[PDB]
Amino acid sequence: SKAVTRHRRVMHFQRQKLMAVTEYIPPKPAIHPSCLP
Amino acid sequence: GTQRVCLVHPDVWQVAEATALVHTLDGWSVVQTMVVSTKTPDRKLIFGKGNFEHLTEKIRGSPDITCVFLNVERMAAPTKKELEAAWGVEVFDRFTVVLHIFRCNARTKEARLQVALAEMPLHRSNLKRDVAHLYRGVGSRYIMGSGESFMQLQQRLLREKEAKIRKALDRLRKKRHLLRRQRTRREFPVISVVGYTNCGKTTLIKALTGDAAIQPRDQLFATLDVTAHAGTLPSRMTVLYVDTIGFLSQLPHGLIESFSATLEDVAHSDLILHVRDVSHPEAELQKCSVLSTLRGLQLPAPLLDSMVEVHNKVDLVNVVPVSALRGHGLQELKAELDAAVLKATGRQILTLRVRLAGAQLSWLYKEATVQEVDVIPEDGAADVRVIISNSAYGKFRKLFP
Amino acid sequence: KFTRSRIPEKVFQASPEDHEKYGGDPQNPHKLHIVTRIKSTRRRPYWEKDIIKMLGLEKAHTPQVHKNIPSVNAKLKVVKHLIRIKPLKLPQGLPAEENMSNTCLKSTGELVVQWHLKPV
Amino acid sequence: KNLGGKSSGRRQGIKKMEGHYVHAGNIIATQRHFRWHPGAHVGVGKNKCLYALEEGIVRYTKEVYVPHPRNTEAVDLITRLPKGAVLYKTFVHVVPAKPEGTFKLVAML
RNA sequence: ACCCCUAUACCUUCUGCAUAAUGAAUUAACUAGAAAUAACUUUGCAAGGAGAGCCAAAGCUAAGACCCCCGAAACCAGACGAGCUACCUAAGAACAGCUAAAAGAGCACACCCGUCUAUGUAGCAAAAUAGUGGGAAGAUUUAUAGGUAGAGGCGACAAACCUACCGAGCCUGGUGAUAGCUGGUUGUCCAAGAUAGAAUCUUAGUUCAACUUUAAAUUUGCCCACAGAACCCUCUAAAUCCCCUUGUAAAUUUAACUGUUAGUCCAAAGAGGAACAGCUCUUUGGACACUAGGAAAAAACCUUGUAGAGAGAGUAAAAAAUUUAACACCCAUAGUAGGCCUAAAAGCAGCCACCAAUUAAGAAAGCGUUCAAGCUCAACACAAAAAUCCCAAACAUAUA
RNA sequence: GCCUGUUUACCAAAAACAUCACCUCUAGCAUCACCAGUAUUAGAGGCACCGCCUCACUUGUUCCUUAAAUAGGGACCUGUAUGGCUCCACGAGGGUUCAGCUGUCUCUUACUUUUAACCAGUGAAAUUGACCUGCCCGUGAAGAGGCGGGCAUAACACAGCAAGACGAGAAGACCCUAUGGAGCUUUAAUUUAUUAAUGCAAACACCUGCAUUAAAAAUUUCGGUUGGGGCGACCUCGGAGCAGAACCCAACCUCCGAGCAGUACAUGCUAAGACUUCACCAGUCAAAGCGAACCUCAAUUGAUCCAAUAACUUGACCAACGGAACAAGUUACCCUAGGGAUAACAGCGCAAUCCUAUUCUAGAGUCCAUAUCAACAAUAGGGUUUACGACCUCGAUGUUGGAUCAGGACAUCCCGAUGGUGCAGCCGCUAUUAAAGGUUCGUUUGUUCAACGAUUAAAGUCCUACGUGAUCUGAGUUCAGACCGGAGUAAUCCAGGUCGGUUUCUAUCUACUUUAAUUCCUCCCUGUACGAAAGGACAAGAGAAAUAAGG
Ligand SMILES: Nc1nc2c(ncn2[C@@H]2O[C@H](COP(=O)(O)OP(=O)(O)OP(=O)(O)O)[C@@H](O)[C@H]2O)c(=O)[nH]1
Ligand SMILES: Nc1nc2c(ncn2[C@@H]2O[C@H](COP(=O)(O)OP(=O)(O)OP(=O)(O)O)[C@@H](O)[C@H]2O)c(=O)[nH]1
Ligand SMILES: [Mg+2]
Ligand SMILES: [Mg+2]
Ligand SMILES: [Mg+2]
Ligand SMILES: [Mg+2]
Ligand SMILES: [Mg+2]
Ligand SMILES: [Mg+2]
Ligand SMILES: [Mg+2]
Ligand SMILES: [Mg+2]
Ligand SMILES: [Mg+2]
Ligand SMILES: [Mg+2]
Ligand SMILES: [Mg+2]
Ligand SMILES: [Mg+2]
Ligand SMILES: [Mg+2]
Ligand SMILES: [Mg+2]
Ligand SMILES: [Mg+2]
Ligand SMILES: [Mg+2]
Ligand SMILES: [Mg+2]
Ligand SMILES: [Mg+2]
Ligand SMILES: [Mg+2]
Ligand SMILES: [Mg+2]
Ligand SMILES: [Mg+2]
Ligand SMILES: [Mg+2]
Ligand SMILES: [Mg+2]
Ligand SMILES: [Mg+2]
Ligand SMILES: [Mg+2]
Ligand SMILES: [Mg+2]
Ligand SMILES: [Mg+2]
Ligand SMILES: [Mg+2]
Ligand SMILES: [Mg+2]
Ligand SMILES: [Mg+2]
Ligand SMILES: [Mg+2]
Ligand SMILES: [Mg+2]
Ligand SMILES: [Mg+2]
Ligand SMILES: [Mg+2]
Ligand SMILES: [Mg+2]
Ligand SMILES: [Mg+2]
Ligand SMILES: [Mg+2]
Ligand SMILES: [Mg+2]
Ligand SMILES: [Mg+2]
Ligand SMILES: [Mg+2]
Ligand SMILES: [Mg+2]
Ligand SMILES: [Mg+2]
Ligand SMILES: [Mg+2]
Ligand SMILES: [Mg+2]
Ligand SMILES: [Mg+2]
Helix, strand or coil: CCCCCCCCCCCCHHHHHHHHHCCCCCCCCCCCHHHCC | CCEEEEEEEEECCHHHHHHHHHHCCCCEEEEEEEEEECCCCCCCCCCCHHHHHHHHHHHHHCCCCCEEEECCCCCCHHHHHHHHHHHCCEEEEHHHHHHHHHHHHCCCHHHHHHHHHHHHHHHHHCHHHHHHHHCCCCCCCCCCCCCCCHHHHHHHHHHHHHHHHHHHHHHHHHHHHHHHHHHHHHCCCEEEEEEECCCCHHHHHHHHHCCCCCCCCCCCCCCCCCEEEEEECCCCCEEEEEECCCECCCCCHHHHHCCHHHHHHHHCCCEEEEEEECCCCCHHHHHHHHHHHHHHHCCCHHHHHHCEEEEECHHHCCCEECCCCCCCCHHHHHHHHHHHHHHHCCEEEEEEEEECCCCHHHHHHHHCEEEEEEEECCCCEEEEEEEEEHHHHHHHHHHCC | CCCCCCCCHHHHCCCHHHHHHHCCCCCCCCCEEEEEECCCCCCCCHHHHHHHHHHCCCCECCCEEEECCHHHHHHHHHCHHHEEEEECECCCCCCCCCCCCCCEECCCCEEECCCCCCCC | CCCCCCCCCCCCEECCCCCCEECCCCEEEECCCCCEEECCCEEECCCCCEEECCCEEEEEEEEECCCCCCCHHHHHHHHHCCCCCCCEEEEEEEEECCCCCCCCCCCCC
């Protein structure tokens, strides 16, 4: 299989773990701003 | 793609027609013309050896010739093989050239399917050459497997492909009947515009209907789809003109008959309009070709008999002479078309007295073409001159005693 | 192609936040590393295998003392993903000849020079 | 259609990098074109290979390029160069280590 | 004892075998590494050694150690075969009955053959039985004796037949033929040990190289700081070479050898294919061809490796997550059917302008009209499916 | 094919071989064949009686035959090609056919004998790693009794069955390989030892020696790479990408080129030290010195031996280019050693091809994307086609169809329910749900298919080792025989046509062996609803049948 595939090539499990661990974590704003004056 | 062609015309105008066919390809250029006489059209070499050697030396001396277009309806396999070997270039006939332009211009799925059916004979003829690169010298010594040989398997595959194409075309014919159901039920008069290739059918339909989306091209076989466009006659009656595919002479009947699936709309037409290209030198030969093509298509005999004729392209130079581009005889032609549809669709132009109440007048407007209304207020009624079909007349008689 | 990895130098430039987190003053740096192999050299390149052998970290979870000098640091950078590096701490100072037989390397990284094995 | 291209690698290039002790006659670098130009105490063979003309240490430097006036192509390139421009090339040098010799007392006449 | 938990016979071959690849029913017995040159070790003697010959610039003498089994189709020589069969020679024999008449005549016995079917297929039979069928006074069938013998004979040529297996008989001998091919290659224990290519009638093999093993001599071996290694080309990758220190202990050389040189997947840079293949081809690296744990079972993924006993302990990798589409309500007079355009084209076929009245309305954003008309709107007002039968059971809330 | 006859004993009995007749060639002669013969003779051959000539076969159209014909027969029409037409009789030869006949079949049944089962006597064979020998799904050396997850599970005989144990049998006959064989053919290489001629010698025609020419033979070979093998292409050397930066890197990978030329005659001799195409061989650079003056080009070539030469030196497009001194074809007459390292069937990977569904809203559909479709394209799903790969199997996984029995999926052909419609009704089209049940008989052709005839409610698409040959058939394909057309000098071969051609197995194990029906049609509703007419319904009810199951 080439580096560029027409389909999403399966990642090596370690690469998958890397991508899962380095996912974007949004900032949790403690108290939800919606229900603050 | 790009092809420089030598137009080799056997002889026993046509050169101009073949040149137009070549120009239609958008990448094919005639770089030489050779009108050669012969007394034996049917032979392995169409020309006697005396002319054949001269043609061969001329063709091989000219280096710009990428191919040769032999203006013959269809050349046999031995003839093609011998000519190819002698002239060292590809050989094309009327069948192959027309088939190529059909494939190029075909855009709709229906057109592609029909041109595939038309191609089928070409594929059968070129089967040996198209599979010569797959033989691999396997057969008759491998002791296991289906008994079919290489050529037998290839022929079986070709037959299966043809069967698939024919099944798809039968489904297409059923769907075309389904589409025609509604127009038939509502009793729209249908006029099928037939004629020789490039004679102005599309231009005439554009002139009659007034539509702007219609694009009459300059190349041959521009229209490959049978399509219906509505128009209005002087009697305020709406008539549906069916633009069809043009016909060509000295061409195998099977090529055009492969379009019968979509051309069956012509059979169900109420009238047929033959667009004669009077300005063309060979208008008589074109008439013979189109009439023979229609008979081969098996159009109804009453319809072919009632066929009207219109002489288009009269500007360049018992019937109605018309000029589609200039729009000269269009009003007259519309008058004769009105008369023809009245006498063909069984529509009676009659005066009818109706009480000016109960929505009878509105019913007549919506179910018939009210030519005029003369109202008598003293009796509170109206006499309508209306073109009404038999079905509409019966409905009115029952609904409003 | 998979090749040896050149670690950018900016990786090994500690920040004040790193100093606060890990408890190490940029001035007065520690002298010795306690290095323990916490990862197998199997499925790793032969150069990493060789560097591990050179550092003498063949046995896992076996602390080894090394100099905190640029060359040893370069080797440790090469094999940094297979090892745990901590600063060797000497609360009672360097062991002397008298107490050389009573030393012990506590899990905290401190080389205590008196090991009585008695309650405090 | 494509025939040939089976030639193997010439195994050319630098044989002595900078700082390498080199004895007289050693080939420093083999090249098909003039990648590294001969410097002090470095000679060129017929096939453009650089060999050490003296025993010493190899040093690679960048030095201005001044072709021989009879090298027509290089002189034309220079003639077309804009003013202020100076060509540079990589030169290979052999810094001789040992002295040519020593004066020794041979006889106390 | 079983029930509990763990456990995919062995050998060979292979990249990889529980493999549904080979061999093996099992017991007993038999059944397969022969050796020179040069080296190595140990003695003797020593510028000499040796029991003539030979060697010698520490050699020489002696000893120790050192290289398998079965298997072809074949080829040639000499014998033996024509009691089967092919043909021929000598002298013999058989051919009912009927029709016809001196018949390579017809029907049809004996007789000879073997068309078709069934049975049989380790059979009654290494070619048969039953029925059916062809010939059956002839080029017929057959008894007896003889002849032609293999680079041959004989042949109404089917490459037929020649003593059951004739593209060339059989036996013996050369012969233990040869086989780069397959199979086999028998006590215990420990250790080192998977690694670029070149040439080759060569890619099923071999020689050299590389790798590997042993012994010996010596000193640098690996990791690697600066500095350094090209323009063509305007820009441009991971990196590489070289390399003191440093951490380490290996490296080179000498002597003597084999064996591996038909390889798999994974990550990455690419090429071919179709940006298919558990596809093929190079490069860097890893793993497997070795142990163990995990990913379900699992050669190639992850963890982990140097080996024993323990009814101790800390850990490594190691368990998937997800559930997704409501929505405005009211209201509409009108410069005029704005001009041109066209039969008319009227907000709506096209072009120009796109102002303007009513508090509030585009010279009209979509339908609809041949054209109109009628409808609104804008404006006011308030995700999937295939074939034997889904696939642990389950579980949302007890403090990492 | 003239006929009677002959033949592959043991798969082919024939159209093949022979055959009278005819034709071609050779020979003028006796004491072992021919021949105890003598040109009306003998031998070696070709073809096939006789008779007529020196027209036959191919391209299409058509007629008869059948209800239906790729079958059979007969015409005409286009081009190819002194050995072509003519069937009298005959034929276990190959096709077609009237009529009859009949269990061939619709559609099987009854009985007798053998076999069989039980009792008694006698008593094998292949086979066999050990077996304490289950099913489903998944996995895996790519198809599990043994592995993972489930399910099932007291132990045993006896009789049947043939789905599996890639079942037994033959170290696969197919295919490839081996510097393994053999048969045959040759204008393959090398010879003429042997015969027959001649010529020259020797002797005075014969014999002997030496040459030349033929016949006959003999020995030996028939390269490699290769996405299996064949065909085609290629085989050595150099430059550039792939391989961006020390070196090195494959490809039947992309492109370029070379097999010289030119100039000089110190293009002399020597000699440190280095490079090196990953070995060796070979190939490179070169200080200093003597002697002199004051080599360009990337490749531009080839070893040993052996020949020529007094010597120096020279000699192969030895291009299969590390080079055999000199050797080709064919084998289905084949053989042996192996190979699943390598092909054909199958499985498996893949999905280019193929099939299917959605998305876009161009375009058809009179207007109207969306009743039905649908271009350019996008996203998905399937594993039924044509392919590609070569992963299991070559110490055998038996092959296309058909019979028999069928298991399964639903992407439904019919029967059921429902939505839309360009649904007035009847016919329909489309879509959702539904796999309980069903899904015909015939002519031609081996046909799976296809065309045609008559039906049906329908004559569904597939998978199951292209389900099913230890249940069957062998018509084709695909052995050995033989023709016709083509290729070749021939042997022989051919993706051309055809006639004939051995179908083994007693069951050890697993598995299994007695489990509320559908549909059509007739009548009535009703000639009603609907419809202008034509035509023409549902629902409910009654009656008839057919099939299937059980008796
Ligand atoms: N001078 C002239 N030209 C005309 C006239 N009518 C038609 N033509 C041309 O004839 C050609 C025909 O174009 P179409 O009308 O599209 O052709 P068609 O008849 O549909 O035929 P196909 O192209 O075969 O489909 C075009 O070049 C027209 O312009 C006429 O009256 N006068
Ligand atoms: N070096 C070399 N040797 C040759 C050449 N030609 C022939 N030979 C030698 O001769 C052998 C070839 O023998 P042939 O082929 O018979 O030679 P030929 O010259 O063609 O013919 P004969 O003279 O009959 O041998 C080679 O192997 C060499 O031993 C050549 O061009 N060069
Ligand atoms: Mg047109
Ligand atoms: Mg190259
Ligand atoms: Mg086995
Ligand atoms: Mg095997
Ligand atoms: Mg066995
Ligand atoms: Mg006899
Ligand atoms: Mg008699
Ligand atoms: Mg007789
Ligand atoms: Mg024969
Ligand atoms: Mg034969
Ligand atoms: Mg015998
Ligand atoms: Mg042997
Ligand atoms: Mg070991
Ligand atoms: Mg341990
Ligand atoms: Mg509004
Ligand atoms: Mg006969
Ligand atoms: Mg006979
Ligand atoms: Mg005989
Ligand atoms: Mg026989
Ligand atoms: Mg016989
Ligand atoms: Mg027979
Ligand atoms: Mg004959
Ligand atoms: Mg028949
Ligand atoms: Mg008994
Ligand atoms: Mg399974
Ligand atoms: Mg039983
Ligand atoms: Mg049985
Ligand atoms: Mg088993
Ligand atoms: Mg078997
Ligand atoms: Mg075998
Ligand atoms: Mg063969
Ligand atoms: Mg041989
Ligand atoms: Mg070298
Ligand atoms: Mg070679
Ligand atoms: Mg044959
Ligand atoms: Mg064999
Ligand atoms: Mg296959
Ligand atoms: Mg394989
Ligand atoms: Mg492979
Ligand atoms: Mg077996
Ligand atoms: Mg469904
Ligand atoms: Mg057969
Ligand atoms: Mg027969
Ligand atoms: Mg046959
Ligand atoms: Mg059988």
